[PDB]
Design a protein around this ligand. Sequence first.
Ligand SMILES: [Cl-]
Ligand SMILES: [Cl-]
Ligand SMILES: [Cl-]
Ligand SMILES: [Cl-]
Ligand SMILES: [Cl-]
Ligand SMILES: [Cl-]
Lengths: 142, 142, 141, 141
Amino acid sequence: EKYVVTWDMLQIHARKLAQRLLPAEQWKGIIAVSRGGLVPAGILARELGIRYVDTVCISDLKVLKRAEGDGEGFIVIDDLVDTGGTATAIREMYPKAHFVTIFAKPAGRPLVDDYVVDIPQNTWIFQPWDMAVTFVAPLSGK
Amino acid sequence: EKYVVTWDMLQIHARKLAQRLLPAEQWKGIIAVSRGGLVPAGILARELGIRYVDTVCISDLKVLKRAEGDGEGFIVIDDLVDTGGTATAIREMYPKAHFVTIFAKPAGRPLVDDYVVDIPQNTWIFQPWDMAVTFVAPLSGK
Amino acid sequence: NEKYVVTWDMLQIHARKLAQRLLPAEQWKGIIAVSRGGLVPAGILARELGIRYVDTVCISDLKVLKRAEGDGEGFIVIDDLVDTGGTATAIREMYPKAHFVTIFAKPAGRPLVDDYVVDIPQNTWIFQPWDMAVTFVAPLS
Amino acid sequence: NEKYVVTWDMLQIHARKLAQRLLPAEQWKGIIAVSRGGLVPAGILARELGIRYVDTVCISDLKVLKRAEGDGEGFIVIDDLVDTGGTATAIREMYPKAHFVTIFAKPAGRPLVDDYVVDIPQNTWIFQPWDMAVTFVAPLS
Ligand SMILES: [Cl-]
Ligand SMILES: [Cl-]
Ligand SMILES: [Cl-]
Ligand SMILES: [Cl-]
Ligand SMILES: [Cl-]
Ligand SMILES: [Cl-]
């Protein structure tokens, strides 16, 4: 039911993905799927040496802001593809991009080129930006 | 081929397991399978309020040191069951213990009562005590 | 020559202290991340403030690879570190009406930001969380 | 009243500094962990020194739940923290020939150990890595 993503695991997954995206010279840039794609974008950008980073912001679908063009030469990175509503729109608007995510649930999974971790459709994922390291009582209260 | 266990993930897995082992009053103590079982033992001991913690030390099988008795009322905890050579001996020498591990590869998996994470037989597992947080060059060298 | 080593958890603690000072969220049109250093702090602020409008500026007569349009009115501009003031001056030139904020500030960058969380000595040898990872190390024996 | 918060990574850094001082490994029959606090540092030392003989002592006229036999000759005895000296005095009584070591020492425990890595003020409010975990926190918005 619950899946907890720590910062160190997200980075491990993002670095695994960056290794698959070598060589860096094949890319013009990275488009982050906001807000969830910002952290994995920053990690891929650091690993690949890519300084051209842009965003697409999707909120009944509303586009708040988008990077221009059809995605040719670009990585488009998400943290999670879930229902496939956002992934459908991204795959459609950037048809020539290499569309990657860290996490894929089944409804989103076949709409990306690549993902690192499969998660069941009904699992509640907590990303690192949703959590804090806090005191936790012994589970037994003893 | 490679599976990296961070300290924070090991703890998450050990706390999940401790929750399954409630209530704490059903246990006389915990036996750690040394050396790998020491860290998960300490986490279970903290979560369960259990102060009676002992070890079994197995090294062609040699027993360097073992806790006395048949395991009745005890949790026996390992970090990993791998080939099943150690898990066979532990399951045999502590037949009444509740034998748990964090990680199970298939050859060891059916010799425990409970485990948290399945790992493929041929995956090289790095436990937190095998690693350090160090500077890492950008994968691209750019 | 001690390394100042930032953990993911410490970066998030500092980003949250900053996000608290930027409340209420309603006052902002969005966040502009200074690429690449500002992307992770932008993801944190955007979660904390419930802001979905996030854009970037990618700096090289000021030359840019890419920039969010406008003079920054209504925007938070976020960097991880203002160090020499080189990037800080290009942000003030491009976005004179943004609220320009940083996690870390050295004295050369400090005068050019609206807010920072942690100031460090100019000489500080700073490693951000994305510069470090767990790697195998042989036993000491 | 600041919390002194130990991370897993910092505990391991300190345990490794200690393991380096205990080389060579050949000089030890084994390690006795002071339960429960010493179990995690025992797992680290045992990996670093390549020691497979690890035993425990579980303290309550000194009363124990369980103890490794003998007077400690050839053994490292490891605790996480010597605080009041209450546990430290029971270890010296039971294992007068052990090399008694700790990660952390407060002044009341300090005189009763052979080695420590980090000394902290007697009043320090210390959280070990196993007292903390990642938990959901609502956004600031
Ligand atoms: Cl989706
Ligand atoms: Cl085994
Ligand atoms: Cl940069
Ligand atoms: Cl700067
Ligand atoms: Cl205790
Ligand atoms: Cl003590």
